[PDB]
């Protein structure tokens, strides 16, 4: 179950003390798809790399261009979550 | 242990059959910081919302802009 958090600064230049980061994950695998028949990728997997590039902190939009680079071929590194 | 995968299409029109989403997570909390004191927030938590805006699929750069729109106050919804 979720949790609400409320942080209020005491001065303009005080930090929150928070280091945020993003990960791309495999949300859904289409039935009988290329990815499905291959067997190596599973739903929930986190994507460490796409076409040799690390995808941590990468926007979904930038990942799109990273995938579109290599027509017909997609390399990835995934990890069970 | 991380697994390597290579998918090869047979036409540029064909799909791989993959739906991807991004999630913003709490990577590290600074010792004795405002967040470590005034929060029930822990390292590894996923951020679901910032200032009422769902953060799923939001890039870090857009979250930065959203966080600064409310100078001084930060509201979040997180999950273990």
């Amino acid at each position: 179950k979720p949790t609400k958090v409320t942080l209020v600064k005491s001065a303009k230049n005080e930090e929150y003390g928070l280091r945020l980061a993003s990960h791309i994950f495999v949300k859904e695998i289409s039935q009988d798809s290329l990815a499905a028949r291959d067997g190596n990728i599973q739903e929930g997997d986190v994507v460490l790399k796409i076409n040799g590039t690390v995808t941590e902190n990468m926007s979904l939009t930038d990942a799109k261009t990273l995938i579109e680079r290599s027509k017909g071929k997609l390399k990835m590194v995934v990890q069970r979550d | 242990k991380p697994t390597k995968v290579t998918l090869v299409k047979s036409a540029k029109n064909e799909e791989y059959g993959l739906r991807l989403a991004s999630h913003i997570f709490v990577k590290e909390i600074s010792q004795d910081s405002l967040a470590a004191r005034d929060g029930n927030i822990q390292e590894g938590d996923v951020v679901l919302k910032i200032n009422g805006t769902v953060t799923e699929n939001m890039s870090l750069t857009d979250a930065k802009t959203l966080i600064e729109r409310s100078k001084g106050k930060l509201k979040m919804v997180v999950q273990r």
Binding site: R19, A21, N57 | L60, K64
Partner: peptide, 9 residues
């Protein structure tokens, strides 16, 4: 792993 592109607030 601290990255330069992490969001520190």
């Amino acid at each position: 792993r601290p990255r330069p592109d992490d969001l520190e607030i």
